[PDB]
Symmetry: C4
Subunit: 394 residues, 4 copies
């Protein structure tokens, strides 16, 4: 009477019936019911109910009934305790905040890391680099052409290839367009080939890489076909396309999607927006305050000879002090503008220290997130897959 | 005789009666008393006293009796062990320093994070941003006006808006005062409205935000009403108020009290004064020593032609060397003053290394405190509240 | 029937026969066999099988059968659990990724840290510094000569020792060759002595230190013997050898192989190639993007008077912007080139912040690896060796 | 026969007699002896030996017998396991390196943190600041005078107080000597007073603070008494003492010995010599290598017009490159010398990255040591002392 013994894997557990009756609906509440012999396994010889579960972790679950607080043991992994409490019918959202972050720690990372007879032949040839042997060579050729185009784009801006000769203006070397045309013909061939053999055309269009590639390809054709009449409009649009040429520097992301580190970095960035917002707010407040202080401190040494007190200082006003504050708070220190008054040097020292602290605040959080994600992702490489040795249904 | 058995949740614990008698007053001391059968639950069939507690944590409490030292197990949370030792009557202030910081770790953070029929309608409309729908719009309007006033304050100091025309002096653009007046009429309206419908007027006055707002509002009225006679006094007070204009840059803190990160930062700053004092002392000692050394090192290359040996160096004396030491110890390095002698370069290298070390000493402590506070505070957002499932009194 | 009890070191474990039959081939599968009494120790009085193993760690192994997932307890060391699961016949490559990195953590470090009657007398005299008393003195003499040669090599490039006097050219001081000859005779003696008394001559040649030493010695002889005819060839080869003189600065690695810290650093570098690759890729992407942005941002303030818009800026093109991006992303900030336009300062601030983040990403991983390796290596110094007290075969 | 049962605090432990016989001399070896009934507590009714010890930690000690390896559980503190293994007679120096650093972790810190009827009245008045009420005021007066002397010493070097008037030379202001004399009379009084009432005079002399104070006091008397004849010797010694004046800046350490942070820093420095040596060696190697590389890289752009190729570069030689390497490897970047050739910029980038890595290697070790020491020392402030409630001898 009022005493019940629980046998969990050969380990006896003894408690009062009243304590088991605290939480209704749960399996233990069913066990506290007097007519539960036909429900659970029970032997009248020992008068103890039998289970088959981990005996070292049932203690915390029972202690939740005994006291009222739910905690997770630190000697077992999170998923193991989660499964164990799921079996007994305890809702996992009742654990105390003292031991919540470690509990829901691996699950978030795990879920974030996972968040026409020839059409299969053609589509797999261009998409998966290692689905075959030829796809590797195609990917390497694309890498070569991308690097060539980027190199040409960087060279076009140099003064050696832009002689001065409209009266004078300046012209780029002719072959710097021929190389670009050689790259463009291949890029057009590849884009046209893949847009035909892609299932779910609308999904293909919705992708950002495809539109980036199309936008990169278009200006060459526009320029080569728009060298005729309408002088004003032609000259405006040619300058606009000359500016927009930069979009072909973004094609490098097309072939770097297969690198593990970049995917880990992308997940880290997507999972750490709040820290970026916090860092931006901290920097804004610090920059504003220190710019105001450094502006007002440098006016002490104002010479009593000029109508404008800003002749002996680099800090003519506050907005120009924003730049100095940003440079100084990150320990960069270009040196183009620095305090020159005994009162300004104290503010400079304070600015340096405050910048160090306010930068060191959230960066460790971001770095820890990246480290955890990277470790988890790199663990997958060591263990490819197994053959599910544990056959269920004993 | 001299042998007793303790049953803690189905787990047998056996010890001599003498060991239980070490600590008087405690529940175990009562248990060691021969006439305790009427006090505690006891069955003559098994001759063991019965309890209902966690069996895996009673071992450490009993070991405290057995040896004399009190330690906390590392497989359970701090609060769980604290409650368990509280039940048995053991004072928590007796644990050894080897395992004290982890024990009293969550409690400090938890306590620090928590450290006229229309008057309710009016007061809640201005104070709580999200107590209703209109309060959100009022807060947004206040944000707009605050940003406008700050922008005008920053613009007033620029040279483009201060043409030179008393003989010449300089004047600010007229509309830069009209915008400020438009902001200040709203600010006056809001401040006057809230000061009427605030319960506990003295508490309202004691708040720093209200006095900041009043001090920000006052100078505009003083200037607009004090443009008359008494030329000397008027000209002095106008300059004084022109200086004090900066106080309206502090109203940004009025609406940032609702951001979680800033509250966490405030708690971190309030809980880490000792580390700031330590950092300041370290920096002072380093700056003094290295300024002296760099002053004395640069005099080796003194040219035997000038009465003052400080003509070939930036280090004319020690106080000017304070600035170089501060700049160099934080890896900032403006470059306005640097050593130029073979003996000074060694001191410069030593200064850089010592600065790195003496900065890296306490900053990790401060950062760890901030990280723990931020994690605990952010855990609250995920779990709003529950319905107290565990009904007491079994 | 369908119920079995396992006795592991005095601790009863109870489970159904069906659960033990999940994994075939394992020892428990043999135990589930009905005719296992003649195989394992078993007493009909208690009807329980007896073992001699740790009872606190068998629970997780049995739980692997009960649920299907394999985890490692956090209350015991990795090697202990590894040995325990090896005894029971469980393959260690089945543990979940949630608890894999900590499991295979010490093993990798441990394996990485371990990855003619006079010939023994002569060879040990030069190789092992502390195999005797004389070897210490020989090593010290070699250190002295190496330092002298390095000092002379550094001095040869100074202008004080290179007076101008072929019509003018320049000549080095004579004694700067005599000191080198004095060092070279000893180095030749040592190298000749060790190459004779080295077993496995081909292995000796395969070593990098020996070829480094030979390459360092050779140019002195070549120069001292090649000051004759064939003016053109002699003058070319003399300049080439003057350039190659630098190889004698690498002999310092010959005597630093015995320092523990350098060996730990070598192991850390060899074990962290992926992080270096990741860091290089991140830096390349950041430098490219920010160089492009800073080039395009500075052209806003182009003066409408010059054909080339790059007259008011340091950023004449993109390749020169690579250098500024590299300098700025590491918070170095020489200051030789900095933005001077309101649009360029925003890009500069973004570049500084992005550089800080992208550097702080993988460096903690590398540092953690070094710290673990160094701690493990320094643990060996405290404990030299023992006398294997535990005699096997009880 | 061949089977024994051990009762450790109510927990049954069962093992073969042969396993207990592995380690001789230990208490378990005595227990394996057949004639041990008269030695240990034993009851023939249960045929089990009884002990009074922690049952959860005896498992690892027994497992040491079972397998041969000794490990420490991670669920208990180091001192608890140390005491437990000390009781059973196991030498603590046999634990494996896999779990040695955490075991011997608290002990090292704990031991390092602890490594004439009026004579008691007088001596305590000057030494202990808070042994009384007057000692506090005496310490404050000493602080005031020390600060005044340091301020005067710093002011003496400024140009404002050194007018030019031997023909011209320069003289310091007269009162800058009177203030020093006022400080010196008090310092002499204090030093003379304490040197009389100090027990163990030789120990008093052996202290560094006393000799520092005496050396600081002496030059004032020497100067004030040595303004007479022997012009050459007087003028030499006066300059020497003018140089040695700096020793009075070190008296600040006299009163900072009572600050907790400085004592913690001293212990950290004394306990981390190896890391400093490692850091110095790393920096030396890096500086040498990168100085050589940057010297040889800048000679590519040598103009074919000058005899000395070092006219277009800051890197005239290697020793001057040492300074640039030191400045660049710490991300300081003064900017007084920087590469100006496309080949030198690559070396500069490599130097910056290598410097960051080689600095970030051992600094975390040093910082972790400081943090542990500081936490342990600061824990003492919270818990002053107790009254040893646990009375031994049950
Ligand atoms: C020690 C810490 C708090 C830093 C010290 C900051 C001091 C030096 C700064 C901060 C605010 C500054 C003052 C703000 C406003 C003005 C008005 C101007 O017309 C003259 C200088 C004067 C009066 C400044 C003097 C210098 C000042 C007092
Ligand atoms: C190697 C470490 C300890 C750094 C070395 C510091 C050396 C180079 C510095 C520190 C103190 C310096 C000395 C202090 C005082 C003077 C008096 C002055 O009239 C001539 C230079 C002279 C004699 C300095 C020479 C340079 C010096 C010895
Ligand atoms: C706020 C964050 C996103 C940074 C802001 C970057 C801005 C200021 C930069 C990035 C790209 C830049 C533009 C890129 C291209 C050109 C073409 C050039 O002929 C005129 C300037 C112009 C139009 C630039 C103006 C400044 C610009 C818009
Ligand atoms: C990519 C990594 C390895 C950095 C690249 C370092 C390169 C650019 C450096 C390192 C060593 C340098 C060479 C070393 C020696 C000399 C001899 C000199 O009379 C002409 C330049 C020359 C031939 C240097 C050219 C630049 C050089 C090759
Ligand atoms: K700098
Ligand atoms: K810098
Ligand atoms: K600089
Ligand atoms: K820096
Ligand atoms: Zn908890
Ligand atoms: Zn402890
Ligand atoms: Zn796990
Ligand atoms: Zn271990």
């Amino acid at each position: 009477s009022e005493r019940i013994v629980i046998n969990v894997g050969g380990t006896r557990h003894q408690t009062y019936r009243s304590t088991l009756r605290t939480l209704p609906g749960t399996r233990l509440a069913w066990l506290a019911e007097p007519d539960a012999h036909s429900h659970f396994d029970y032997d009248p010889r020992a008068d103890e109910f039998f289970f088959d579960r981990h005996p070292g972790v049932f203690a915390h679950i029972l202690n939740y009934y005994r006291t009222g607080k739910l905690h997770c043991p630190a000697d077992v992994c999170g998923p193991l305790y989660e499964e164990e409490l799921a079996f007994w019918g305890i809702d996992e959202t009742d654990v105390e905040p003292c031991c919540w972050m470690t509990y829901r720690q691996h699950r978030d990372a795990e879920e974030a890391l996972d968040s026409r007879r020839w059409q299969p032949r053609i589509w797999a040839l261009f998409e998966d680099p290692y689905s075959s042997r030829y796809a590797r060579y195609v990917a390497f050729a694309s890498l070569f052409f991308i690097l060539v185009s980027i190199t040409t784009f960087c060279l076009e801006t140099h003064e050696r290839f832009n002689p001065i000769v409209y009266y004078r203006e300046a012209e780029t070397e002719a072959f710097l367009t021929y190389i670009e045309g050689v790259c463009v013909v291949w890029f057009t061939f590849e884009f046209l080939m893949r847009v035909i053999f892609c299932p779910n055309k609308v999904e293909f269009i919705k992708n950002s890489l495809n539109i980036i590639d199309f936008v990169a390809i278009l200006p060459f054709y526009l320029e080569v076909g728009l060298s005729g009449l309408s002088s004003k409009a032609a000259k405006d649009v040619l300058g606009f396309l000359r500016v927009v040429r930069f979009v072909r520097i973004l094609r490098i992301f097309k072939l770097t999607r297969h690198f593990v580190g970049l995917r880990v970095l992308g997940h880290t960035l997507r999972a750490s927006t709040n820290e970026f917002l916090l860092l931006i707010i901290f920097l804004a407040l610090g920059v504003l305050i220190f710019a105001t202080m450094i502006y007002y401190a440098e006016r002490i040494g104002a010479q009593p000879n000029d109508p404008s007190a800003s002749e002996h200082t680099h800090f003519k006003n506050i907005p120009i002090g924003f730049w100095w504050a940003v440079v100084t708070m990150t320990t960069l220190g270009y040196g183009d503008m620095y305090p020159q008054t005994w009162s300004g040097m104290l503010v400079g020292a304070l600015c340096a220290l405050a910048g160090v602290l306010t930068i060191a605040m959230p960066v460790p959080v971001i770095v820890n997130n990246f480290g955890m994600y990277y470790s988890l992702a790199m663990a997958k490489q060591k263990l490819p897959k197994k053959k599910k040795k544990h056959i269920p249904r004993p």
